[PDB]
Design a protein around this ligand. Structure first.
Ligand SMILES: [Zn+2]
Lengths: 85, 29, 83
């Protein structure tokens, strides 16, 4: 009977541990589902915005080019004024 | 059963335990 | 009643196997959570990086329009002087 009492007590300890682990697993499932939703959202948002890397680099090059053209005109004008000084 | 060693933290647990007393992992995990 | 102890022994062993298996499932979920947390921070920064490119793109476009106006104004001054 003492082996029987020992087995019965341990089985009840196992049943409580099964429930405890399950509650912890329930929480982790909710975390995983929320992270999955957030990651899918962020992934879509990044993809829709990806074009701006390309457009930024193209726009910057265009800006640098017209700035160079403008500076050339400014130099021509300054020279023409100084030639007439 | 007798005592059993936790295979994660190496602590030797009492025969009555089903979870490690240190790390709470089950004996066969 | 030794076969009765066997019976209960069998039930306890199954409970311990199911318990260990839940723990193994938990281990996999903790790894999932860690990988997702890393992927989400990475994606959040990458989205923020695209937002910086968007801001800078609009700022470059604004600068380009202003420089174009300035160039037209200089071109006019030159035209007045060369006429
Ligand atoms: Zn342990």
């Amino acid at each position: 009977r003492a082996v029987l009492k020992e087995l019965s007590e341990k089985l009840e300890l196992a049943e409580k541990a099964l429930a405890s682990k399950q509650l912890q697993m329930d929480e982790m499932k909710q975390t995983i589902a929320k992270q999955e939703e957030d990651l899918e959202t962020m992934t879509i948002l990044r993809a829709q915005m990806e074009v701006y890397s390309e457009d930024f680099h193209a726009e910057r090059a265009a800006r640098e080019k017209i700035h160079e053209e403008k500076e050339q005109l400014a130099l021509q004008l300054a020279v023409l004024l100084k030639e007439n000084d | 059963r007798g005592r059993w060693a936790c295979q994660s933290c190496t602590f030797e647990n009492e025969a009555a335990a089903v979870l490690c007393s240190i790390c709470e992992r089950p004996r066969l995990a």
